[PDB]
Structure formats: structure tokens, C-alpha cells
Amino acid sequence: DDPLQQTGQLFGGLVRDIRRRYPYYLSDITDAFSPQVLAAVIFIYFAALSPAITFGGLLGEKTRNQMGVSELLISTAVQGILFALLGAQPLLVVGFSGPLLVFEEAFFSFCETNGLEYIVGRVWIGFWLILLVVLVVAFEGSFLVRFISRYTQEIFSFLISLIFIYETFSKLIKIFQDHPLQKTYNYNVLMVPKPQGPLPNTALLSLVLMAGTFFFAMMLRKFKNSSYFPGKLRRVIGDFGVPISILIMVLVDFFIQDTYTQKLSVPDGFKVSNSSARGWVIHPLGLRSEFPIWMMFASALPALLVFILIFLESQITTLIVSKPERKMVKGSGFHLDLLLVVGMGGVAALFGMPWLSATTVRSVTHANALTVMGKAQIQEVKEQRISGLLVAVLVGLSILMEPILSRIPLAVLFGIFLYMGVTSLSGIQLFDRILLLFKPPKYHPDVPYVKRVKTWRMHLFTGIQIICLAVLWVVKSTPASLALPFVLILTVPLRRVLLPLIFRNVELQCLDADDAKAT
Amino acid sequence: PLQKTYNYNVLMVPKPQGPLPNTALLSLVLMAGTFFFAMMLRKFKNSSYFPGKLRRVIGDFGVPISILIMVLVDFFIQDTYTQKLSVPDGF
């Protein structure tokens, strides 16, 4: 039975996913006894805490510290545990995103322009998103995701991957820039709150940490499929390679005493940032004065656009995770996770907490972590609820391990970002055609879209795709980035009409494959 | 070796006396860059990414290419000193 199907029953698709998924409860409970699950837990723990800290610092310095880092980590823990507990697909990883930050800063700018409160209206926005998601899910209007082919999916994934790789190198370049290379340095500079001024051996040591971590990780991964050791020892080595490299880099950093490297910073306790102009509960009616009536009647509009953003991104992520190619065994849900995320965003907005949603890179990395692979062929993927709830509990309780987190150099995590970025390049078909662009036709592959169409036809199709990617890059670089989703959905009609009017029907059926195998 | 403070009133003309901030570890960086580029080029040489003439012609001179890249990288940086070749004035 189809996870998506036009059903004339109220709560139809929801109950269908319920009946498809709940009878596997005991199996989901049982299947998390392997150490590879623990490896996934420890890896995604870092992979979720580090961008959380980055985004928290960014929005703290952006929003006059209206919201900080402690609220973000506590929330991320709450949505992680509950999404693992009651999610139809608990294999997703939730978090904040860049366009969401753009929305928050735009709302803050609008509020300051009008003189309104920033945190007060968020409760009302939660109210409109709650009523609107009830309205939408009432009609089971998910079938629109059927219009998304592999073209739009892969182009969105590729742009996300390239953007995040660019962010990683931007981080490294900025940290290098903060301490330039001079000939002489004055040593009467204070270092207590922050590193002020250039330092001799810090930035390039961070670069060395990145390079060594990445080199060791790739050498280990390439050796994992070798034939140097018995299979048991080889599997034991392959199960926990990344934490092994992490420990090696950490001990190397701890052995060095003189040079300073920036380490992790976490809240002291479960406390608010302002602790002066805020409390645990925000009164929706008004903190210092009453909330305007014309705002009460006209503030529904941004709720529409934020719901559109979270809806499209979550459903695209659900398409990514639940593809049958990665040995998708049990049932996969779309409606239940979406409803849970939107309702939880609303109730978090009741507390003043911003909304969170599943992240693409974290989700694909999570799917990659729980993979049983062969000598190649992919046998299976271990799917259950335990890893996500464990990760969320760990990010909730990370505050209690202050000395351990204070000894982690920041560049090792950046190397880990480089690792996830390069490993997110596996499932792309656009990368396959990009590789095909340069290779001579004498050694071109056995896939149907090489035999059935000519050489310059493949080159022109990939040129169309990269031109689309360049336009999307111009859109994301545009300061009016709020129009970012719109051009994206502009991909949907363009494939149906213009391309078949230039290409042919056999090229249409061979190139735009719904599944990797079947064409 | 690595310290926290370095005195800048030391003479460098006949030979580098005393520790210096960014010399030997930069030589280690050059180690990594040169070796990594050489291995990447050699492994890519027998690939199938270019037409055969172009690929083999490019791979025919990998070591001087990496040497030139390292020399230009060294020349671009001005402030720090790295030890260079010494030859007699004459016969």
C-alpha cells in the first residue's frame, strides 16, 4: 500500500501510516542492540551539537541576544526525543536553517520598524501555523509531492551540499584571517574573553588538525574494504573509525601545551540569555503593553510563508530519506512526522521558542551511518527509534560534561564537517553526469542514459542542469533571499513543458528516471 | 621548538639562531602539500577523465609541476624565512 494516496477519508493517510508503522514497535525496540547504532549516536551527537552552537552564536549576536544557545539546545533535545518516540520515520534529524534565520531577522526588522515586540507575536504566529496545518492535513493534500521527480530532488540536494561545503571553507578562511601572519607580535595582549589580535601558531595548527583528521578518516575508510585483516577484525575497525580519529586528534591536541586553540563554549546551566527582560513563559497578550489589534488581524501572512518553507523542506527531506534504493525495508511515513513537527513548532512558539525542522545533510548522514554494506552491494539499513532519542538526550545533558567539552579543538569538528560534506556526494546523479562531462566516450558507462542518447545531448542536458544551479546560486546570493523557494518550485513546470519540446520522448523516459535501476 | 613568547632581537644573517615562529612547521605543511599533490597526480594519470593524449601529456611532468606550485606558494608569502639552497661563489 502507497504511503501517499488520494483517500476520501478524513485522517486517511495519517491512519494508513499509523497502521503501517505501529505493528513494528517491538521490532524497532529490539533492533538497536548493535554497536554500529552507538557509533551513529556518538557521530550524529557531534554533528548536531556543533551546528547548533554555530547557529546559536549567530542568532545571539544577530537578535540582541533575545534568544541564545541554552534554549536552542533544550528545545533540540525535546523535539529529538519526541520525534524519535512518536515519529513515523524517526530517522530524521531536526534543526534550524539559514532561511529560517533570514525569516527571523526579517521579522525582527519589521517589528523594530513598526516598534513592536519581537518575541510576543511569535505565539500568535504559532497559533496561525497550528490552525493552518490542521486545515491542510484535514484535506490530506500531500499528493503534490508526487510532482517532484529526481531532477528537482538532486538539484536541491546538490545546491545544499555545495552551500554547506562553501560554509565550511568560509569558516576556515575567516579563522585564518583573524590571525594573519606577521613577522613580529606583541605579547602584552589579554586573552581572557576572546583571542584579540594575531597569534603565531594558532590558525595554521587548526589547518593541520583539519588536514590530518580528514586524511586519517579517508585512509581508514578506504582501508575498511581492503583484505589485510580477518573479517571480524576488519568489521571491528570499520564500525568506529571516525571516533577513533577524533580521539587521536584530541590526544594530540592535549599533548601540546603552549599554543592556544579555540575550544567549545556551552551554557553554564538551564538559564535564559536576557535573564532580565524575559521569563520562562511569555504572556501572549503583552509584556509591557498590549499587542496591536491590526497586527492581530494582519499578522497571519508570514505564517503562510513559514509554513510553506517548513512544509516543502520537510517533504523534500522525507523523499530523500525514504527512497527504496537504500534497502528501505519497513514502512515509511510522510504525514505523521510533518504534523508532529508543525504542532511542536506551534507549542514551542507558545513558550517563545523558535521552530525547528528536519535538516537534509544531517538526515542523509544519519541514513549513511546505519548502513550494512558488502564486498559492491548494499545489504541493508538498520532503522529504529533508539539512536535519535539517545542523541537528543545527550544534547540535552551535554552541559554536565563541561571539562570534556572544554578540551575539544574547534578545527577537528570543521574537518568532520568536511567529512560529511564529501560523503554527502555519493547519492547525486548530477555529480555522475558532471563526471561524465569530461571523460572521453571511449570508456563511458553501461547506464541507459549513455547508450540511448548521444554525447552532446548528455552535455547539453547537464548544461541545462548546471545553468539552473547557477541561477539558484544567484538567487541564494541575492539579499532578497525570501524568493529562494519560489524559483525552486519553478523547476516543476519547466521539466514538463519546455524540455520535451526540445528533447524527445525516449530521452524523457530514459534520462528522468524515477528509480536508479528501473528506466 | 614552540614557545609562547619569542625575542625579536636575534640576528639571522649567517644562520637562524634560536627558535622561530613559523618555519619548520611550515616546512611540514610543504611536506604534506607536495606529497599529496604528487600522489593525487600520479593516481589520476592512469584514470579515464581526459582524452588520452591530454591526460598522458599532463601526467608526464607531474613532479616539476608540483615543484613550481610549491615555489610560487613560497614566493607569495613574504614575512617568514625558510632555508634556501646554498652554492659556492665559484670554482
Side-chain angles (χ1 to χ4, degrees):
Chain A
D1 46 357
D2 269 328
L4 61 90
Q5 184 75 260
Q6 273 268 4
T7 308
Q9 271 191 336
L10 188 68
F11 297 113
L14 214 66
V15 169
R16 288 181 310 118
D17 305 340
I18 287 170
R19 291 204 176 110
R20 187 194 323 115
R21 193 72 202 189
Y22 291 170
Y24 297 95
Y25 198 95
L26 189 64
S27 176
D28 289 6
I29 289 300
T30 294
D31 287 333
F33 283 165
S34 302
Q36 200 159 340
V37 177
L38 183 63
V41 162
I42 185 60
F43 182 76
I44 307 162
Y45 169 58
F46 296 156
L49 63 87
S50 59
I53 293 176
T54 292
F55 275 114
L58 258 64
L59 61 83
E61 86 172 355
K62 201 74 57 176
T63 72
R64 291 213 282 111
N65 201 222
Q66 284 282 349
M67 295 299 291
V69 285
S70 61
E71 316 92 3
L72 266 59
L73 61 87
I74 293 176
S75 177
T76 298
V78 172
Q79 287 86 20
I81 53 181
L82 272 194
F83 185 80
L85 277 183
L86 272 299
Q89 174 76 281
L91 284 183
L92 293 191
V93 176
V94 287
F96 213 70
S97 182
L100 314 182
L101 174 76
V102 175
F103 182 76
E104 298 291 344
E105 71 90 20
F107 182 76
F108 188 84
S109 166
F110 181 74
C111 279
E112 300 307 317
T113 300
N114 307 289
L116 318 172
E117 284 92 314
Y118 169 79
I119 208 70
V120 166
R122 313 196 74 253
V123 178
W124 309 112
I125 299 299
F127 285 164
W128 287 279
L129 66 87
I130 284 170
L131 59 94
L132 195 153
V133 65
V134 175
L135 288 172
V136 171
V137 181
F139 295 103
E140 314 288 322
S142 183
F143 75 104
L144 290 85
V145 69
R146 196 189 61 254
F147 291 123
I148 289 294
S149 46
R150 192 184 284 267
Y151 211 63
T152 318
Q153 189 50 276
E154 297 281 17
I155 197 67
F156 176 70
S157 64
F158 210 58
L159 62 83
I160 281 293
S161 299
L162 292 172
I163 280 173
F164 272 11
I165 296 171
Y166 182 79
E167 300 320 308
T168 61
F169 292 100
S170 172
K171 289 167 192 171
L172 183 63
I173 291 315
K174 174 58 152 47
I175 301 299
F176 170 82
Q177 279 172 9
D178 291 330
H179 307 255
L181 187 149
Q182 311 173 340
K183 201 183 313 295
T184 175
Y185 301 108
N186 292 323
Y187 304 103
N188 284 336
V189 285
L190 59 87
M191 282 320 128
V192 172
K194 194 194 74 174
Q196 283 69 239
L199 291 186
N201 308 302
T202 293
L204 66 92
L205 263 292
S206 65
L207 187 153
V208 169
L209 294 174
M210 185 180 288
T213 314
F214 190 69
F215 159 81
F216 270 107
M218 290 325 168
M219 194 153 180
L220 189 148
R221 180 162 184 259
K222 212 179 77 171
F223 161 82
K224 183 189 72 176
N225 295 318
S226 72
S227 67
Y228 268 99
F229 277 157
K232 276 205 160 280
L233 186 71
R234 166 146 66 248
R235 291 182 285 277
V236 165
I237 284 290
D239 272 327
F240 275 75
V242 178
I244 281 171
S245 300
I246 283 177
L247 292 181
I248 293 178
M249 295 298 102
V250 161
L251 68 92
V252 167
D253 176 35
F254 171 76
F255 285 174
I256 305 308
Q257 294 288 334
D258 284 10
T259 304
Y260 149 77
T261 51
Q262 192 167 358
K263 316 286 192 308
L264 268 74
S265 66
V266 289
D268 52 358
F270 306 100
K271 295 320 284 176
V272 290
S273 56
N274 260 148
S275 343
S276 53
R278 283 154 56 264
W280 310 79
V281 188
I282 297 89
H283 195 62
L285 277 296
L287 214 57
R288 80 291 186 277
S289 88
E290 66 274 0
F291 155 76
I293 320 295
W294 71 295
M295 294 298 102
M296 186 66 204
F297 293 138
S299 299
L301 182 149
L304 275 294
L305 189 151
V306 67
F307 182 76
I308 284 182
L309 292 168
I310 62 171
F311 181 76
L312 72 90
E313 196 272 333
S314 68
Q315 297 324 103
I316 288 185
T317 309
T318 313
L319 272 194
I320 297 169
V321 59
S322 66
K323 53 180 56 180
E325 281 136 16
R326 50 173 62 107
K327 304 308 173 309
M328 151 54 78
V329 183
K330 279 173 232 190
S332 72
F334 280 63
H335 315 92
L336 183 55
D337 297 355
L338 168 76
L339 189 142
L340 272 194
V341 169
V342 185
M344 272 167 97
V347 67
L350 188 153
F351 287 92
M353 186 66 204
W355 34 79
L356 311 174
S357 84
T359 318
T360 297
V361 179
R362 275 164 260 169
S363 305
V364 58
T365 303
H366 181 189
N368 289 348
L370 300 166
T371 292
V372 178
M373 80 308 291
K375 207 162 267 182
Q377 70 276 16
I378 293 297
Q379 289 80 16
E380 59 157 348
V381 164
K382 298 174 173 162
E383 318 179 31
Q384 75 272 4
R385 309 177 173 276
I386 288 306
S387 173
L389 54 89
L390 277 185
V391 164
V393 163
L394 286 191
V395 307
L397 272 298
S398 306
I399 312 178
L400 273 300
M401 283 73 74
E402 195 95 5
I404 291 154
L405 268 65
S406 71
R407 298 184 181 277
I408 303 179
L410 212 55
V412 165
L413 302 104
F414 299 155
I416 297 169
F417 290 108
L418 167 63
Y419 191 98
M420 42 195 77
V422 66
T423 47
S424 69
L425 185 140
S426 82
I428 312 300
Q429 63 160 349
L430 171 57
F431 182 76
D432 296 331
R433 271 198 267 119
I434 287 296
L435 284 198
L436 259 58
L437 290 185
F438 297 91
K439 306 190 175 185
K442 185 181 184 299
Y443 312 97
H444 274 182
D446 214 28
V447 292
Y449 61 92
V450 168
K451 313 169 184 298
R452 299 279 260 273
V453 301
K454 297 188 282 190
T455 289
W456 72 305
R457 299 286 180 84
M458 294 182 286
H459 287 104
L460 209 63
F461 195 65
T462 310
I464 288 167
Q465 204 160 359
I466 62 170
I467 284 303
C468 292
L469 183 63
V471 171
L472 301 174
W473 191 295
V474 171
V475 164
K476 67 94 177 179
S477 161
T478 308
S481 194
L482 279 190
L484 190 151
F486 274 17
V487 55
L488 196 68
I489 65 171
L490 188 153
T491 305
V492 160
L494 175 82
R495 147 77 174 77
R496 303 293 182 181
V497 186
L498 268 182
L499 268 66
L501 284 195
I502 301 182
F503 286 73
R504 288 173 296 117
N505 194 0
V506 64
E507 309 171 318
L508 203 63
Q509 279 161 31
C510 182
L511 276 161
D512 195 3
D514 214 351
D515 199 322
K517 303 190 287 181
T519 316
Chain B
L2 73 165
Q3 289 173 336
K4 292 183 178 292
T5 176
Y6 296 100
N7 287 353
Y8 305 104
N9 272 342
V10 288
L11 58 91
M12 281 315 108
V13 184
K15 199 196 74 176
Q17 278 67 238
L20 289 189
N22 306 304
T23 297
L25 70 167
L26 273 295
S27 70
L28 188 153
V29 176
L30 188 153
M31 295 298 103
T34 311
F35 191 71
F36 167 83
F37 292 160
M39 290 325 168
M40 191 145 178
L41 192 148
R42 182 159 185 259
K43 210 179 78 171
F44 172 83
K45 181 188 175 53
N46 300 136
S47 66
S48 67
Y49 269 93
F50 291 166
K53 291 214 171 60
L54 178 72
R55 169 167 79 257
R56 299 184 212 98
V57 162
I58 284 303
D60 201 14
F61 273 67
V63 178
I65 281 171
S66 299
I67 281 177
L68 292 181
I69 292 178
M70 295 298 102
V71 174
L72 65 91
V73 160
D74 173 38
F75 164 73
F76 286 171
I77 307 179
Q78 295 286 337
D79 278 9
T80 313
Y81 149 78
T82 48
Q83 195 170 357
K84 314 291 193 309
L85 276 298
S86 72
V87 287
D89 57 356
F91 310 97

